[PDB]
Amino acid sequence: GFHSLRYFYTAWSRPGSGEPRFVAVGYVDDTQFVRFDSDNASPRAEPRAPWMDLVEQQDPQYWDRNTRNARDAAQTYRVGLDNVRGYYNQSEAGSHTIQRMYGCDVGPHGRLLRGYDQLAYDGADYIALNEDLRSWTAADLAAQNTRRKWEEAGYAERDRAYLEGECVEWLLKHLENGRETLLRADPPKTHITHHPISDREVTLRCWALGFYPEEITLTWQHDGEDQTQEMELVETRPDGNGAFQKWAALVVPSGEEQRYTCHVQHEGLPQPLTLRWEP
């Protein structure tokens, strides 16, 4: 079992009617804790989770450091959008997008399991740091322009020094300082709904509300046979208060409800749950 510190940048151009916008968000596991948006007046990095309200006392330079970092990042991806547009020989008329996702997965004893740093252009793979943290994979010919530059500058080493050092150390700081928010596993509150459609056909919907972390499995079974191919399974959605919701539904013959069981697996439960419908 591991925890993650992940950052997500998006930069995108407004060709005519604006300079590019740049947004950055950081997550520990499924919890957002920081943001930056270049559109604000004098834009600053800002806290988004409660323990981040105490970082200023624990690290008095944190906000200034990271604000300066984010503002340099916005400036270089604004040039980066023009460089890449030229690699693809694209015109200046249309809008384009650069995305970056980087961070570390860390197992129990502060042990790095994986580092990553990936970029996308207009929503497709552009260049990624390889698992060995010493080489880059370029997605196409245009991206080779970038790989060659980053190889000659030796950026992989700087990325690897961050992912093995700062990324791991700061995950641990946020995990400890944010223990109340981060190191919990709230189990879902579950129940089954019943809304018939015809005289002899019924929908059974298995709900799971307020759980954290986001990972969860809901399964419907008939007489112990799995109904995965037949179920309607909605995408997990945020409830707005830092937790998540999900349901799974199955259409079933009327009068035959009690032969269907909903299986629920979540980290916050002692044991997976089976669930029947009951009047």
């Binding site: 990095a45 990271n66 970092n69 270089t76 460089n83 252009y121 950026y155």
Partner: peptide, 8 residues
């Protein structure tokens, strides 16, 4: 902290 950012 944020990492460094490299120019594509």
């Amino acid at each position: 902290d944020f990492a460094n950012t490299f120019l594509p």
